[PDB]
Amino acid sequence: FLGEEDIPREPRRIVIHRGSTGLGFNIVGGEDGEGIFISFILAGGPADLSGELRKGDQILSVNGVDLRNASHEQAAIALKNAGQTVTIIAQYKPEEYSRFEANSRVDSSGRIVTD
């Protein structure tokens, strides 16, 4: 029933409490201000358990630190050093994301499809 509803494109706040364990997602991007995007979310990891992040989300900030224009390595450092409670502002940007992943495109509901 859900799969035809448009994925919301407004920014959201996500709070993940992960102690001293990994967040459980991978990032792509960071070159020349392209943005930092979630590319993979580990099943059973803290990001998965949040239920509030998906592939193709841009990370706008972590703990108030603006990552819109971050480099890949400094983004990764910000995330890994954010502390036990990690407050992410995210925004779903599937068109931008789709340019990174082979054979990917965005459908009418905003979902990323890979042929």
């Binding site: 990994g22 997602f25 792509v28 590319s39 890949h72 390595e73 990764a76």
Partner: peptide, 6 residues
């Protein structure tokens, strides 16, 4: 090209 696990 980079991908980092966090």
């Amino acid at each position: 090209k980079k991908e980092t696990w966090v």
